Paper text:
In contrast, despite observations that UL32 and its homologs in HCMV (UL52) and KSHV (ORF68) are essential for production of packaged virions, their function in packaging remains unknown. We reveal the structure of KSHV ORF68 and its homolog in EBV (BFLF1), which adopt a novel fold and assemble into homopentameric rings. The central channel of ORF68 is lined with positively charged residues that are necessary for nucleic acid binding and production of infectious virions. We hypothesize that the viral genome is threaded through the ORF68 ring, and that ORF68 acts as a scaffold on which the terminase assembles for genome packaging.
We obtained crystals of ORF68 that diffracted X-rays to a maximum resolution of 2.22 Å and used molecular replacement with the initial cryo-EM model to determine the structure of ORF68. The majority of the protein could be built in the X-ray structure, except for two disordered loops (residues 64–67 and241–262), and a region in the central channel (residues 169–172 and 179–188). ORF68 forms a homopentameric ring with a diameter of ~120 Å. Each monomer contains three zinc fingers and several bundles of α-helices connected by loops. The central channel is constricted toward the top of the ring, with a width of ~25 Å, and widens to ~45 Å at the bottom. Residues 435–451 form an α-helix that is anchored by H452, which coordinates a Zn ion at the bottom of the ring. The subunit interface includes ~1200 Å2 of buried surface area, consisting largely of van der Waals contacts and a stacking interaction between F59 of one subunit and F335 of the adjacent subunit. ORF68 contains several motifs with highly conserved cysteines and histidines. These residues form three CCCH-type zinc fingers, as supported by the tetrahedral coordination geometry, a large anomalous scattering signal, and C/H composition of the putative zinc fingers, along with the previous observation that the homolog from HSV-1, UL32, binds zinc. The third zinc finger (consisting of C191, C192, C415, and H452) is generally conserved in the alpha- and gamma-herpesviruses (with the exception of the closely related model murine gammaherpesvirus MHV68), but is missing in the beta-herpesviruses. This third zinc finger is also atypical in that two coordinating residues, C191 and C192, are adjacent to each other. Mutations K435A (top, more constricted side of the central channel), R443A (middle of the central channel), and K174A/R179A/K182A (henceforth referred to as ‘3+’, in the disordered region of the central channel) all resulted in a drastic reduction in binding affinity, with negligible interactions even at 4 μM ORF68.
Numbering used by the authors:
A (entry chain E): 2 to 63, 68 to 168, 173 to 177, 189 to 240, 263 to 467
B (entry chain D): 2 to 63, 68 to 168, 173 to 178, 189 to 240, 263 to 467
The structure:
């Protein structure tokens, strides 16, 4: 069983349809007193609510093919960026794990939608809170403080306003002066996915473009949206920012972060683009002009094989590319955690079988070895929260002050977060 | 091809008139819902919009001496003050460079105006942001923070209010790197090319200044005819750093002595000699504005100035304009520190000039102005002019003033205290 397979998405087009419909915003929220979808998402974001996915799983465990297939999904999620595509894929792969190991269970059918799992529940379990990580007991209270803050500011993005200064061991491996520097993905994963030997799994770009052009205007039939649904903002309740807002030629749903999780050569295609932008021009041309100059060229970016991804990146505005490579802290967090090999290279069966054994034995899920820091993660969500919701000016500049300090402690070079918050969505 | 030539201005009177017309303010701005000129300038000042001049250039390369003629223009700007005249000259010399090396492409004609280039675009590219300086890649992010601040406060001067403490942050420049020697002058290649009494000077740009600004403004109390429905009391001020002409205490937001620094070959040394006369001749406690009046009442004043036009202009300025320029305004101080009258106005020796161009086209001479170059001090100067010409909160206004005073002392610039200056002058 392997995650991130476009085929798994098409197989469950029926169930996902229930998930995609349930992840759209109401067309006219002001004309109803409530809405059951928003009520449940809002409930998932209250700090003392149960985790609906953790509760589903415990329901099923009170085989062997199951702890080893589930631990694969967890490992893939741990090495995946935070975005819509990762939630879609984790949704599909959770269907498959449930249809594989539990075909007789009623929880397996009608898995998504109102009263069952929702997009936000996937986000919380696999990406925001990472319930699957193996963590020591003495780290539990500390983690809950940070999870509390994340829930509050994510809920703020849903409802529109916020209700830190009171609330705020080295935090991670980077700030750890003892540790040996990060090699890369752990050894067993490098053995299993790496090497010129490997063909690619199918790209998720077609599904992404279908769903989002059908149910939003992000890009100006797998998914059919209802009316009394907001077809201008897409299935954004599966995205970290919970909405689609436009500013300065950018949008709150970053398309290049979607590419990091939906296409096999996006991680490095962008890393080389960043290198071309910094290195080719040797004078004081500003970053959005450098991007226009690099991508003005008719052959632009030959290092990218798939002409579709090339067509997409060259179609982005210089502001979208500026925001993603140099400004937004969540884009920076997304780029540092992804492993394009784990996500998209077809695994070698001999090495994969030990990986499943090791992960289900609880050995590869303690931390993302490329980047893993709940402190920086939390501030990234706090920042996106002040960017997308009403927040007090004084806490707002408190977050900005601390995020900048941590960005430097962790060797992440961005424009100043206050500039980023002025410029972009 | 040599920049800063009155002749270059004269031949392109056609394109340059179109720039001056597009550089006046609306006559009655409140009676229209918008204005395409103001909308575009305001668009050029947003931090994530492209540089129109950079975009013109890349569109033109996507010859063998274009890169060297453009690099000469850049070198001159680097050693030119920030003012109307320097924007006019860069406009003219950009025309000339386009007719020499790109005469069949349509971009060259209709170079200026709505939908094309504007004064703000020339100012941003050649003077405020200096896109041509050779900068290391690892320093770009930091630079964009400072350019952000500059754009915002210049945009405030355009619209009237501002929309620092959040964004503000090794020596910053050669002045505060106290392990280096104190600056002596322009590079050797430039010294060889421009210096020596043997060298004849190019024509004074003062007539062009005096003509254009008297026909389309009141700054002085036909190259250019202004349209109707335009504010003919403020001149082509959208080519000037303050984006308007306002008056206070016998001064105006357009400083005439800064125009002279860029428009006339002996203004830099004349004013520095005047500064010595003002400081040194009186030996008792007479105020600076009276000392200025005493030096310039004498009928034989400033005999070190040969050109009687420059001499009469300086002597006609009010003691506040001269007080403001020599002792108070921080943008006037930066302008005096950056300018080289030799580069701008002495006829180059062609054998050494060929070496200059090769160096400048190879990027070696555009790393930094060796007389003064500090983007920190540049940014604070634009912040201060912004609080002076636009609505800014009291707490952030007094924050700029205190940081600017600290940097002024750290860079050995002796000015009156900026709070005094902000109270006194435009
Ligand atoms: Zn969970
Ligand atoms: Zn950390
Ligand atoms: Zn992104
Ligand atoms: Zn430029
Ligand atoms: Zn300095
Ligand atoms: Zn001046």
């Amino acid at each position: 069983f392997v995650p991130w397979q476009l085929g798994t998405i098409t197989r469950h087009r029926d169930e996902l349809q229930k998930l995609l419909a349930a992840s759209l915003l109401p067309e006219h929220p002001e004309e109803s007193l409530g809405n059951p979808i928003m009520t449940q998402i809002h409930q998932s974001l209250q700090p003392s609510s149960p985790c609906r996915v953790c509760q589903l799983l415990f329901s099923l465990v009170r085989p062997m093919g199951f702890f080893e297939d589930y631990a694969c999904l967890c490992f893939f999620c741990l090495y995946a960026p935070h975005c819509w595509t990762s939630t879609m894929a984790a949704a599909a792969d959770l269907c498959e794990i449930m249809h594989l190991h539990f075909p007789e269970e009623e929880a397996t059918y009608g898995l998504f939608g109102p009263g069952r799992l929702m997009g936000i529940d996937l986000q919380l379990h696999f990406f925001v809170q990472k319930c699957f990580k193996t963590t020591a007991a003495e780290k539990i209270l500390g983690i809950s403080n940070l999870q509390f803050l994340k829930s509050e500011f994510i809920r703020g993005m849903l409802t529109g306003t916020i209700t830190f200064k009171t609330s705020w061991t080295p935090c991670c491996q980077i700030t750890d002066t003892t540790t040996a520097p990060a090699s890369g993905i752990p050894e067993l994963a490098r053995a299993t996915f790496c090497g010129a030997s490997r063909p690619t799994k199918p790209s998720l770009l077609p599904a992404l473009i279908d769903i989002w052009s059908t149910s939003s205007e992000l890009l100006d039939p797998f998914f059919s949206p209802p009316l009394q649904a907001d077809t201008s903002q897409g299935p954004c309740l599966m995205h970290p920012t919970l909405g689609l807002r436009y500013k300065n030629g950018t949008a709150s749903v970053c398309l290049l972060c979607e590419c990091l999780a939906a296409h096999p050569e996006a991680p490095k295609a962008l890393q080389t683009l960043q290198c071309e932008v910094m290195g080719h021009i040797e004078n004081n041309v500003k970053l959005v002009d450098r991007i226009a100059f690099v991508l003005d060229n008719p052959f632009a970016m030959p290092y990218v094989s798939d002409p579709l991804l090339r067509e997409l990146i060259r179609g982005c505005t210089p502001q979208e590319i500026h925001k993603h490579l140099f400004c937004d802290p969540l884009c920076a967090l997304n780029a540092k955690v992804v492993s394009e090999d784990v996500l998209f290279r077809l695994p070698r069966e001999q090495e994969y079988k030990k990986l499943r054994a090791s992960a289900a034995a609880g050995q590869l899920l303690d931390a993302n070895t490329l980047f893993d820091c709940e402190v920086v993660q939390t501030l990234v969500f706090l920042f996106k929260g002040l960017q997308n919701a009403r927040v007090g000016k004084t806490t707002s500049l408190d977050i900005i002050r601390e995020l900048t300090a941590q960005l430097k402690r962790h060797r992440l070079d961005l424009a100043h977060p206050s500039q980023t918050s002025h410029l972009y969505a």
